[model samples]
Target: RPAFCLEPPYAGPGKARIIRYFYNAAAGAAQAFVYGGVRAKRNNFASAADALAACA
Candidate 1:
């Protein structure tokens, strides 16, 4: 139930590449959500939070 989570080892260029990969995957999944006209305020921030938690 933490408000914020960190993905450790998120340092250096390699980690940046991983972060970008993660974002790309998320965006691919979000395409349906975007096309469905979901409200901006109702977006799934939890998924990213969960990912960070796992990475931490």
Candidate 2:
């Protein structure tokens, strides 16, 4: 993980708990994929810290 990156814990209710964080040069933004058990969501943020905040 980067300075402010975060990932979901593996002990969630199901196998859908995880996160993927990276910088997207094409979009010029910080990105995260959140698997909140129900669905996988793609979120864009101004910075890694911003993305981590939303990831939780």
Candidate 3:
């Protein structure tokens, strides 16, 4: 399961505001993304908690 966070846009409140953290065991990679952002930012973490925590 993925860990997710609902957050306002970095600039202000808007639609499609969310943060998603995904762990692919096969690839052994943890990925995180800030949705609806003007500039896309991606991240990798050890766990889902850490991923969403950074978003929050």
Give the winner by lDDT: 2
> What stretches of model 2 exceed 4 Å from their correct place?
1-16, 34-47, 50-56
lDDT of 2 by residue, 19-38 (tens): 64544444545565544454
The Cα RMSD of model 2 versus the native structure comes to 8.4
Residue pairs in candidate 3 whose N, alpha carbon or C atoms collide under 3 angstroms: none
**Root-mean-square deviation of each candidate, in angstroms?**
13.7, 8.4, 9.4
TM-score: which is higher, 1 or 2? 2
Q: Global CA lDDT of candidate 1, please?
A: 0.26
lDDT of 3 at 21: 55
For each candidate, the alpha-carbon lDDT, in order, equals 0.26, 0.45, 0.44
Candidate 3 residue lDDT tens string, 2-48: 33223222322335656655444445444554455444323433357
Model 1, residue 1: distance off in Å is 20
Ranking by lDDT: 2, 3, 1
Task: Give me the runs in candidate 3 sitting further than 4 Å from their true place.
Answer: 1-15, 33-56
Over 4 Å off, model 1: 1-46
